[PDB]
DNA sequence: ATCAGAATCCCGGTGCCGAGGCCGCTCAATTGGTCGTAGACAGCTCTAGCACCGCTTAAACGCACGTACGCGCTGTCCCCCGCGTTTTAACCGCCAAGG
DNA sequence: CCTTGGCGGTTAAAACGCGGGGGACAGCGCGTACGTGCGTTTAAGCGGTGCTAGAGCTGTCTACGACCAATTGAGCGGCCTCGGCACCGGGATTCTGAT
């Protein structure tokens, strides 16, 4: 379910981001922020797909949604 | 082709046709696509030179998107131009705060 | 034997700084995407490239968020990061309304 | 089976010109092709806005000049203007 | 010169919004700019959706999905309802 | 009902919206149903701002609407603020806000 | 007639200015600053009054917003006084350079 | 000369009070004036480029409006 | 300070599969000619951006005085990190509808 | 033809427990710099008064860009070889860890 974003995963992401030591209460807030960001991006993607009356959402629609969010992604048919 | 006759590389005809298809103006000038092709060529040449230097840093021959990421994030103006855009399989620059290092 | 706290963490910071592989597990993220898109539209077929782009974008977003979080924590004379640091960083970023 | 158009070979020629020996991966090539598409979109939209603001419909090279000067930061804009002006003069010299 | 404005339209809306609430000219100009920006953004989203799906025409569906994309949930739903109602009673009439 | 707005029962001009859409270069062709939808959306948004502006003016016990009241109406409502956080209203001022720590005890 | 504890004047002036909707900086110094800072781009430029007004509005709004951000950064570290480091932190989180 | 110093200390104090700053350091004013300077520089650079593209030498309000729109600081009520 | 000891990059040997090079094939770029109008340019108007001067008083500014945070130091508590240990399901790989 | 569903092996990784000292809290001990009021100086603001450069509106003739029809070659689909990084084992410094 929602527990797939594990403690070592968030720890690895924080280590890559330059954080030295992380408190134990960071994980839940990180999960919530990830959930809301995914909700926004995937909502835009599914609306883009539904406008075309399709059922399979493409990475092209995801890239368009990210463009709408101002965080464009390269290398995915942009 | 218009590209070779103008001392450039990128296709002027394709640029003008896609300008038509984008409805960027009711009618499009003749010299504007040539300038656009030249600017795109210069931008790509700078990006590719930076990518080649980054590959030479790692003693590599093939361009990995990590090399592009490092090249974009090291140059100032290009990083400003492409700062809001994230690159897949690129990573981030190596930076550790001077306060986090041990005594 | 035993290593002092904060040293192996710095070594892991070094190692994770050079790697570019996706740090999230694939199938848990696929399940998360399906369970978060189920409430919007029903019986949604997903492309592999779509969820891969989602993974990369979310990873970059979380990396930037953690950079801002560490910066907020260190601005107040602190080493460990607190959730209030994330809250303040997102409020200043304009994502929090 | 439709035909998908890209800029792979042109960027490959540019890289070979600026680097005698340099390989290029498919992922990096796609990233930079999408980047070229993004720059194309940015310049075209800026030129369209500039033309509309002056109530014109003909986008000359001057609109692209000002679009590049507004978009590209400083020295990049100046170098692009110099190279493009030289290329435009070269094109106008011949057919 | 002959300069257009949405002054009388906003005035008509205000009369049915509050019969006894006047407005300043500066607020009227701010509202005119607001309407211009909203029109530009919705029409731009519709144009992007049309070009991105290989359609050279802009119809009610594109505007509706653009409104859904732009406005937040409750506001998007209510604006969609208003637009659909207006289109339906225009087609009927 | 001769004007397209009258048939559509809309205060905003359907004809003017159609003309702007045609001479705005958004597509090769413009459907007849799009201007009605766009005019309705514009009318609804202007209203939704107008009622809150009238309530803000009423709270300030002022007969007329001032752009300060417009800024108040935009800021206080969460959805309107979410929409127009990137817009600064002329002579709109800021909301009355004092941090709890800054308040004397 | 008496001097009270420092800070109450700060509360009163903050409340009055927040209730206010005017332009705090004088018009002539701002217009002269605009002329000076635009002389390096194109000389003999003639500045419309509405241009100066729009510039004043935008500048005051940006400065005020930087001020809420700097105040938030200062109170982030359990502090009341604002330091320039808060200003650079606010600009860094904002993504502006 | 030094017209950036024309933005005096009381003006920055009033702007901070409008923002809601309780205590102000003595050297905040320099950094505030510098950020004001850089924002003025970028906005007026965009506006001057826009005005020059129009082949006019009078900085109009709409030029600043479009410059801010590019910069993401859109303003209403000044036309556009 | 100075010795003990794992970690990991450079070095050498494996190796394999996508990139570079090439070939074949086709529809969009290139060229000539035509015509229709967008605008480049000449030209008059009159608007407002600007320069100057005189009052005129609101606003900034230097300074004395005071105390309210800023910052540092010292103590006390605690809770992620790092170690080892146990479980576990994701990934690889294979294999099939089927929409 | 690309997405989804099922199944089997396994090992790399996720999940658990516990010792511990470094970091997060608090609570003083002062130091001084900013907050505030009081004059004192100043410069912004307002009211005329010209002054004149340049934005704006008007018309006219043009010459370039949207159309047509030939034509041909350079870019995309398809195919084949290699080396350069994916990978694995050794070697020695580079740090920390301990005293």
Curated annotation (Swiss-Prot), chain A:
Q: Where in the cell is it found?
A: Nucleus; Chromosome
Substituting residue 7 to R results in: Abolished ufmylation
Q: Name one GO biological process term.
A: chromatin organization
Residues found modified as Phosphoserine: 23
Q: Keywords in alphabetical order, please.
A: Acetylation, Chromosomal rearrangement, Chromosome, Citrullination, Disease variant, DNA-binding, Hydroxylation, Intellectual disability, Isopeptide bond, Methylation, Nucleosome core, Nucleus, Phosphoprotein, Ubl conjugation
Q: Where is this cross-link: Glycyl lysine isopeptide (Lys-Gly) (interchain with G-Cter in SUMO2)?
A: 7, 35, 55, 67
Residues that bear Phosphothreonine:
56
Q: Which residues carry this modification: N6-(2-hydroxyisobutyryl)lysine?
A: 7, 20, 35, 53, 55, 67
Q: What are the recorded GO MF terms, alphabetically?
A: DNA binding; protein heterodimerization activity; RNA binding; structural constituent of chromatin
Upon changing residue 67 to R, the result is: In TEBIVANED1; results in severe early developmental defects when expressed in zebrafish embryos; results in defective cell cycle progression when expressed in zebrafish embryos
- PTM sites of type N6-(beta-hydroxybutyryl)lysine: 7, 53, 67
- Mutating residue 51 to R has which effect? In TEBIVANED4; results in severe early developmental defects when expressed in zebrafish embryos
Name positions with the PTM Phosphotyrosine. Answer: 27, 64
- PTM N6-succinyllysine: at which residues? 7, 53, 55, 67
Q: What does this protein do?
A: Core component of nucleosome. Nucleosomes wrap and compact DNA into chromatin, limiting DNA accessibility to the cellular machineries which require DNA as a template. Histones thereby play a central role in transcription regulation, DNA repair, DNA replication and chromosomal stability. DNA accessibility is regulated via a complex set of post-translational modifications of histones, also called histone code, and nucleosome remodeling.
Family assignment? Belongs to the histone H4 family.
Please report the name of this protein according to its UniProt entry.
Answer: Histone H4
| Gene it is expressed from | H4C1
Curated annotation (Swiss-Prot), chain B:
Per the record, residues carrying N6-(beta-hydroxybutyryl)lysine are 21, 80, 103
- N5-methylglutamine: residues carrying this PTM: 89
As for PTM, the annotation reads:
It is involved in the initiation of both imprinted and random X inactivation. Ubiquitinated H2A is enriched in inactive X chromosome chromatin. Ubiquitination of H2A functions downstream of methylation of 'Lys-27' of histone H3 (H3K27me). H2AK119Ub by RNF2/RING2 can also be induced by ultraviolet and may be involved in DNA repair. Glutamine methylation at Gln-89 (H2AQ104me) by FBL is specifically dedicated to polymerase I. It is present at 35S ribosomal DNA locus and impairs binding of the FACT complex.
Q: Which residues carry this modification: N6-crotonyllysine?
A: 21, 103
For this UniProt record, give its keywords in alphabetical order, as a comma-separated list: Acetylation, Chromosome, Citrullination, DNA-binding, Hydroxylation, Isopeptide bond, Methylation, Nucleosome core, Nucleus, Phosphoprotein, Ubl conjugation
Q: Which residues carry this modification: N6-(2-hydroxyisobutyryl)lysine?
A: 21, 59-60, 80, 103
Q: Where are the transmembrane segments?
A: none
The chain residues annotated with the modification N6-glutaryllysine are: 80, 103
Q: Which GO terms describe its molecular function?
A: DNA binding; protein heterodimerization activity; structural constituent of chromatin
Report the residues modified as N6-succinyllysine.
80
**Gene Ontology annotations for the cellular component aspect, listed alphabetically:** CENP-A containing nucleosome; extracellular exosome; nucleosome; nucleus
Where it mainly occurs, coarsely classed, is nucleus
- Subcellular location per the Swiss-Prot or TrEMBL entry: Nucleus; Chromosome
GO BP terms: namely: chromatin organization; heterochromatin formation; negative regulation of cell population proliferation; protein localization to CENP-A containing chromatin
The family assignment reads: Belongs to the histone H2A family.
Q: What is this protein called in UniProt?
A: Histone H2A type 1-B/E
Swiss-Prot record, chain C:
- N6-(beta-hydroxybutyryl)lysine: modified positions: 18, 41, 84
Q: How is it modified after translation?
A: Acetylation is generally linked to gene activation. Acetylation at Lys-84 (H3K122ac) by EP300/p300 plays a central role in chromatin structure: localizes at the surface of the histone octamer and stimulates transcription, possibly by promoting nucleosome instability.
Cystine crosslinks: none
Q: Which residues carry this modification: Phosphotyrosine?
A: 3
Residue numbers of N6-lactoyllysine PTMs: 18, 41
Q: Could you say which protein family the record assigns here?
A: Belongs to the histone H3 family.
Instruction: State what protein this is by name.
Output: Histone H3.3
Curated annotation (Swiss-Prot), chain D:
What the record says about family reads:
Belongs to the histone H2B family.
Keyword field contains Repressor: no
**What is this protein for, i.e. what is its function?**
Core component of nucleosome. Nucleosomes wrap and compact DNA into chromatin, limiting DNA accessibility to the cellular machineries which require DNA as a template. Histones thereby play a central role in transcription regulation, DNA repair, DNA replication and chromosomal stability. DNA accessibility is regulated via a complex set of post-translational modifications of histones, also called histone code, and nucleosome remodeling.
Species of the source = Homo sapiens
Q: N6-methylated lysine is carried by which residues?
A: 86
Q: Which residues carry this modification: N6-lactoyllysine?
A: 13, 55, 78, 86, 90
* Residues recorded with modification Phosphoserine: 6
Residues the record lists as N6-(beta-hydroxybutyryl)lysine modifications:
4, 55, 86, 90
Glycosylation: residue positions: 82
Q: What biological process terms from GO does the record include?
A: antibacterial humoral response; antimicrobial humoral immune response mediated by antimicrobial peptide; chromatin organization; defense response to Gram-negative bacterium; defense response to Gram-positive bacterium; innate immune response in mucosa; killing of cells of another organism; negative regulation of tumor necrosis factor-mediated signaling pathway
Q: Where in the cell is it found?
A: Nucleus; Chromosome
Sites where Omega-N-methylarginine occurs are at 56, 62
First and last residue shown, out of the full length, are 32 to 126 of 126
Q: Where is this cross-link: Glycyl lysine isopeptide (Lys-Gly) (interchain with G-Cter in ubiquitin)?
A: 4, 90
Q: Which residues carry this modification: N6-glutaryllysine?
A: 4, 13, 16, 78, 86, 90
The identity of this protein, by name, is: Histone H2B type 1-J
How is this protein annotated for GO cellular component?
CENP-A containing nucleosome; cytosol; extracellular space; nucleoplasm; nucleosome; nucleus
N6-crotonyllysine PTM sites in chain numbering: 4
């Amino acid at each position: 379910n929602i527990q797939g974003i594990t403690k070592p995963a968030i720890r690895r992401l924080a280590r890559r981001g330059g954080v030295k030591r992380i408190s134990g209460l960071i994980y839940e807030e990180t999960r919530g922020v990830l959930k809301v960001f995914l909700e926004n991006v995937i909502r835009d993607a599914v609306t883009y797909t539904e406008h075309a009356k399709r059922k399979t959402v493409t990475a092209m629609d995801v890239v368009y949604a990210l463009k709408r969010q101002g965080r464009t992604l390269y290398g995915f048919g942009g | 082709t218009r590209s070779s006759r103008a001392g450039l590389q990128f296709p002027v005809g394709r640029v003008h046709r896609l300008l038509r298809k984008g409805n960027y103006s009711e009618r499009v000038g003749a010299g504007a696509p040539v300038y656009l092709a030249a600017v795109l060529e210069y931008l790509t040449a700078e990006i590719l030179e930076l990518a080649g230097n980054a590959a030479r840093d790692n003693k590599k021959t093939r361009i990995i998107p990590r090399h592009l990421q490092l090249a974009i994030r090291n140059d100032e103006e290009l990083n400003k131009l492409l700062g809001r855009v994230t690159i897949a399989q690129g990573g981030v620059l190596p930076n550790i705060q001077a306060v986090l290092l041990p005594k | 034997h035993r290593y002092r706290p904060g040293t192996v963490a710095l070594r892991e910071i070094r190692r994770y700084q050079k790697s570019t592989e996706l740090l999230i597990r694939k199938l848990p993220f696929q399940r998360l995407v399906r369970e978060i898109a189920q409430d919007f539209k029903t019986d949604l077929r997903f492309q592999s490239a779509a969820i891969g782009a989602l993974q990369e974008a979310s990873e970059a977003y979380l990396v930037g968020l953690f950079e801002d979080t560490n910066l907020c924590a260190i601005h107040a004379k602190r080493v460990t990061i607190m959730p209030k640091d994330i809250q303040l960083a997102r409020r200043i970023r304009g994502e929090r309304a | 089976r439709s035909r998908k158009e890209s800029y792979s070979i042109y960027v490959y020629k540019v890289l070979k010109q600026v680097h005698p020996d340099t390989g290029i991966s498919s992922k990096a090539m796609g990233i930079m092709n999408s980047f070229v598409n993004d720059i194309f979109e940015r310049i075209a939209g800026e030129a369209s806005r500039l033309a509309h603001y002056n109530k014109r419909s003909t986008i000359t090279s001057r609109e692209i000049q000002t679009a590049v000067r507004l978009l590209l930061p400083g020295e990049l804009a100046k170098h692009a203007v110099s190279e493009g002006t030289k290329a435009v003069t070269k094109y106008t010299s011949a057919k």
